[PDB]
Amino acid sequence: GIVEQCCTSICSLYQLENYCN
Amino acid sequence: GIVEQCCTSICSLYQLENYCN
Amino acid sequence: GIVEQCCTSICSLYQLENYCN
Amino acid sequence: GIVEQCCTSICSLYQLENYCN
Amino acid sequence: GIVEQCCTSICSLYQLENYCN
Amino acid sequence: GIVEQCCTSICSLYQLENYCN
Amino acid sequence: FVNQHLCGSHLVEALYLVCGERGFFYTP
Amino acid sequence: FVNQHLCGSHLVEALYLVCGERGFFYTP
Amino acid sequence: FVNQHLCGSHLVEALYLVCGERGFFYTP
Amino acid sequence: FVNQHLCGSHLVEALYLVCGERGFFYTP
Amino acid sequence: FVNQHLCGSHLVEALYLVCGERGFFYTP
Amino acid sequence: FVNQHLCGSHLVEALYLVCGERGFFYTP
Ligand SMILES: *N[C@@H](CCCCNC(=O)CC[C@@H](C)[C@H]1CC[C@H]2[C@@H]3CC[C@@H]4CC(=O)CC[C@]4(C)[C@H]3CC[C@]12C)C(=O)O
Ligand SMILES: *N[C@@H](CCCCNC(=O)CC[C@@H](C)[C@H]1CC[C@H]2[C@@H]3CC[C@@H]4CC(=O)CC[C@]4(C)[C@H]3CC[C@]12C)C(=O)O
Ligand SMILES: *N[C@@H](CCCCNC(=O)CC[C@@H](C)[C@H]1CC[C@H]2[C@@H]3CC[C@@H]4CC(=O)CC[C@]4(C)[C@H]3CC[C@]12C)C(=O)O
Ligand SMILES: *N[C@@H](CCCCNC(=O)CC[C@@H](C)[C@H]1CC[C@H]2[C@@H]3CC[C@@H]4CC(=O)CC[C@]4(C)[C@H]3CC[C@]12C)C(=O)O
Ligand SMILES: *N[C@@H](CCCCNC(=O)CC[C@@H](C)[C@H]1CC[C@H]2[C@@H]3CC[C@@H]4CC(=O)CC[C@]4(C)[C@H]3CC[C@]12C)C(=O)O
Ligand SMILES: *N[C@@H](CCCCNC(=O)CC[C@@H](C)[C@H]1CC[C@H]2[C@@H]3CC[C@@H]4CC(=O)CC[C@]4(C)[C@H]3CC[C@]12C)C(=O)O
Ligand SMILES: Cc1cccc(O)c1
Ligand SMILES: Cc1cccc(O)c1
Ligand SMILES: Cc1cccc(O)c1
Ligand SMILES: Cc1cccc(O)c1
Ligand SMILES: Cc1cccc(O)c1
Ligand SMILES: Cc1cccc(O)c1
Ligand SMILES: [Cl-]
Ligand SMILES: [Cl-]
Ligand SMILES: [Zn+2]
Ligand SMILES: [Zn+2]
């Protein structure tokens, strides 16, 4: 999930768009 | 929805729990 | 109190120092 | 400036890009 | 104090209630 | 720059004033 | 719409804290 | 777990801005 | 009361920075 | 000390929400 | 002026995310 | 890079308050 994905290595704003509804 | 509900009149933390998964 | 004082008219950082312990 | 532009009417993220260095 | 208590190990919202006036 | 300066060791508010316009 | 944008920012921060491990579904 | 809590707060603020009108589904 | 709630959130963030090591006493 | 500074910012935001009308006393 | 102060806080957080590595120049 | 991203968010909020009417120039 997003914490595992984005809290150790940095996530781009593009990656974050995956979690938009 | 939540903006209509909670941005003109104030919402309690109890009301906000409705939007938890 | 601080909400009455600082939420209608703007407070300076100097005014906010009054609430420091 | 940005306060006049974006604090009465809403600004898109695209508009905000103008202020990037 | 609260920084020692809650900045290395995580604090519950219940623990944080201790600091309410 | 500011990330190198202020994200490993802590910066005072006085140090941050250097970046004001 | 600006006031609603500012309010929404605070709503999502509150939901984060209130909902904890459950997470939440935000839709305006 | 504290670092993950702090990070999550920022993740939700970013999702709010990125997702706009669509909203988002946050689950840790 | 919503506007006051939003304002209070910002007041506490400012007091945190202004007051530093002293801390502060927040009461609405 | 930077990590503690960042954490404190989040602590005060959480206390604001948790404590409501009571307010709170923050001291590091 | 309070509303503009609150709005500015959110503007700078959005610019931080939008602008990334470029950074930004904020002037009211 | 995540820690630096989180720190930068707080740096910009502090600069906003410290710099007031002057504004500031943020570059990582
Ligand atoms: N988050 C909540 C609510 C989300 C509800 C889902 N969205 C919609 O139903 C979309 C409605 C949009 C298309 C309209 C809402 C407000 C309208 C504008 C209001 C001002 C003017 C009015 C006018 O005469 C036309 C232009 C104008 C800008 C409108 C455009 C259309 C709207 C944006 C949930 O999830 O339930
Ligand atoms: N948001 C993401 C991920 C969410 C995944 C859904 N949650 C779970 O699967 C629940 C797992 C929990 C029960 C465990 C995760 C970490 C565990 C702890 C780790 C440290 C010790 C290890 C030990 O030996 C027992 C105690 C300990 C505290 C563990 C307890 C159980 C956990 C909390 C998504 O939505 O996908
Ligand atoms: N933080 C500051 C100020 C805190 C002051 C301490 N609190 C009080 O004195 C409590 C006052 C409350 C009980 C009332 C304030 C506003 C009232 C409401 C206003 C709208 C209507 C008015 C009405 O006719 C009755 C209902 C209504 C909702 C009121 C209810 C009572 C109040 C909430 C410091 O620390 O100094
Ligand atoms: N908020 C909490 C806790 C607040 C406790 C009240 N403050 C104090 O007791 C003040 C203690 C200060 C003076 C010291 C704490 C950490 C010290 C530094 C640590 C690193 C080095 C160590 C060294 O050898 C000297 C220099 C150094 C920078 C120390 C300086 C002194 C301290 C800052 C509550 O309210 O309960
Ligand atoms: N960030 C933007 C815009 C920044 C523009 C640069 N600043 C100025 O041009 C300074 C203007 C100041 C001196 C005035 C703006 C608003 C005025 C006040 C309005 C209310 C009353 C009006 C009155 O009769 C006198 C007192 C009063 C308080 C005014 C004082 C002067 C002002 C603060 C960018 O960068 O472009
Ligand atoms: N804000 C401050 C500082 C900004 C300085 C201006 N930017 C640069 O000078 C750009 C430097 C970039 C291109 C590199 C910095 C860190 C590098 C990465 C580090 C880890 C590995 C190392 C490696 O062997 C190659 C890949 C890797 C990912 C590096 C890529 C290049 C960098 C991103 C100011 O304004 O002064
Ligand atoms: C934008 C953002 C916030 C928090 C963690 C990340 O990896 C990315
Ligand atoms: C907690 C909270 C945030 C924003 C609006 C509200 O009504 C309530
Ligand atoms: C710094 C600050 C925050 C909120 C309200 C104010 O008047 C001032
Ligand atoms: C993204 C954002 C923040 C504040 C005001 C705006 O118009 C837009
Ligand atoms: C809610 C919260 C914020 C910061 C640290 C913690 O342990 C808990
Ligand atoms: C005020 C502040 C924020 C972030 C990092 C620092 O060193 C100082
Ligand atoms: Cl606000
Ligand atoms: Cl953080
Ligand atoms: Zn706000
Ligand atoms: Zn943070």
Swiss-Prot record, chains G, H, I, J, K, L:
Documented effect of changing F24S: In HPRI; Los-Angeles
Result, substituting H10D: In HPRI; Providence
Superkingdom, natural source: Eukaryota
Coiled-coil segments: none
This protein's name: Insulin B chain
Gene: INS
Residues of the full protein shown: 25 to 52 of 110
